[PDB]
Ligand binder design. Structure first.
Ligand SMILES: [Cl-]
Length: 216
């Protein structure tokens, strides 16, 4: 396989949906499965080798991929060849709102995150601890982020037309590279649509191939 895509899942999907392999031999896809960044950086070493790589993330995974990239540059490692972010409101924007502390959230407020279906009320109690921990990750990946472009890799934002994520156009500030945004038909999970998935996939492959052209 030429490239290696490192995918970061959303809250709920057990890293399954991003089991996108066989295309036919372009991407070796490896998925996350939930200073935590340090634990990821040295864990991507044995699989990155010296081959080129890219990051894709959805909602929660967008913040995680971003900080993982941001944390690779800090260790003087090479950044991802491309950073693909999906359905996430950037930390520095007019629409962003800070995630409250754990001890300031009620189970009811935790239950509203789980919806991102409302029928499930009793189940929320058993999913409560997973959710609160996931929010802890996101609360950290959105805390103390620089106000200066640290990254330099190219960046594409994907977002649904009926999405709850907003103002992704502002993600361009986190890097000095080229920033593109595509608005696709769907909600917060547009990317499940086999049409949108095909669009995203093909766009990822084209991106990495063009960025891999010799510097002549
Ligand atoms: Cl999420």
């Amino acid at each position: 396989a030429t490239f290696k895509l490192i995918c970061f899942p959303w809250m709920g999907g057990g890293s399954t949906h991003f089991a996108k392999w066989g295309q036919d031999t372009h991407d070796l896809l490896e998925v996350h499965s939930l200073q935590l960044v340090d634990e990821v950086v040295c864990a991507l070493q044995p699989v990155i080798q010296d081959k080129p790589f890219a990051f894709f993330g959805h909602s929660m995974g967008s913040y995680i991929a971003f900080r993982t990239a941001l944390g690779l540059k800090e260790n003087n490692q090479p950044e991802p060849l491309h950073l693909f972010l999906s359905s996430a409101t950037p930390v520095h924007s007019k629409a962003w709102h800070r995630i409250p502390k754990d001890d300031e959230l009620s189970e009811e407020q935790i239950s509203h995150y789980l919806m991102e279906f409302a029928e499930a009320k009793e189940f929320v109690k058993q999913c409560s601890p997973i959710i609160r921990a996931d929010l802890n990750i996101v609360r950290s990946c959105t805390s103390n982020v620089p106000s200066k472009a640290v990254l330099s890799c190219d960046l594409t934002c994907f977002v649904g037309s009926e999405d709850i994520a907003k103002d992704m156009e502002a993600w361009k500030d986190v890097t000095s590279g080229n920033a593109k945004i595509y608005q696709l038909p769907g909600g917060h999970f547009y990317l499940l649509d086999p049409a949108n998935e095909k669009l995203i996939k093909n766009y990822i492959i084209k991106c990495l191939e063009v960025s891999s052209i010799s510097n002549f």
